[PDB]
User: What shape does this take?
Amino acid sequence: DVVMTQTPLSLPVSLGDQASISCRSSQSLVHSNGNTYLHWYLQKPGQSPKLLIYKVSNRFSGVPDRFSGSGSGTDFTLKISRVEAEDLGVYFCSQSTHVPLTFGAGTKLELKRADAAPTVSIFPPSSEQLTSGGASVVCFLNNFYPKDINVKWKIDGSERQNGVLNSWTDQDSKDSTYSMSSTLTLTKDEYERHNSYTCEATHKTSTSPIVKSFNRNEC
Amino acid sequence: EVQPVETGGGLVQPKGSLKLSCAASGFSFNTNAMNWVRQAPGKGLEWVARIRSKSNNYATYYADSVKDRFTISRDDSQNMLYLQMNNLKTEDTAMYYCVRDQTGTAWFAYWGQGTLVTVSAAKTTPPSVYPLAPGCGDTTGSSVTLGCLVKGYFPESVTVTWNSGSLSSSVHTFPALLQSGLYTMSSSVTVPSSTWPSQTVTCSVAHPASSTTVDKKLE
Assistant: This one.
């Protein structure tokens, strides 16, 4: 019932940058006897949470000499010093001064890489899927950065859609870049009454959209 | 690790029940408070329950959200922790962690690997995999994306393997999303244009629940 606000929810960092992840409670945590049960946790992807620092500054048994807790009452700060790769995942603050235990939304330390223009590809529905009674025009926007990306769909020009399923990958160790796939699931009938299918990727490395499109009445 | 270890996670139809177990070998299990914390695949951490120990007459605590649905029990004899989750709801669907207080420093310290509780009435559907391939155009540059759409399965996971004999691929494995009851997913591969379509690409989609293995030659 205290709401642990974390600042910020995403945090791009070069691997020798100082990082700072900031938490803030809706009430004062200075217990009436005990004192400031504000705790920070680390959870690497595909894994359980790990205890880092307890009661703002008291590090836990293992936590490298790079973790620095501090703060008073409603303001708290987790400061990792030189961001080693081992540390990338989500950082949580928790409170256990009041029942119930409330955690923050979690802050994700992402990794810095320069800007990248995505490779867009539009694909038409395989005869094989048509034969079931639905259609999916998949659009793959591949290897971009940053993850600020917007896809728009155009059927015969007519603006937008509402049968879209976007899904992002996490950071692709290698080019280091996110990938994303806009699926558009129509009905056989609808498909067959509409000609041109457009994917329009809106990205920071272009003021002009990356447009990829195909033409139903062909292959 | 010292480990807390948990089981009896599964697929329950709504209003069902599970007896989740947790196993903590440690110095003085006998003396610490034992916790249960869910993490629904949708966002964050929410504490479900907690039980004190013998001294504190096994004082049992619960989050408003699970009260009366769940019972937390402990059996020091065998270092066992339990959670009777009755009359479930879809919103219970989460990863269940076993959490052991570290009496001497702070509480909510040690968390095991977790486990899965899937609440949904949907049955065990196979996957319909369909191959995405350019359309007309053929090879538009040096490399070219290929793909597989895996539409319509329950539950959670499929494994998509690619057959691209040595070919300089970059396979993005995309997370599945829920889609009108069953999940959908997609995977992309990029090939050398000076090998497509001579070289036979294939995607290999297995589904554990229901021992299915569909192969789709990309042509």
Q: What stands out?
A: The CA atoms of residues 175 and 189 of chain A lie 41 Å apart. Chain A touches chain B through 50 residues (CB under 8 Å).
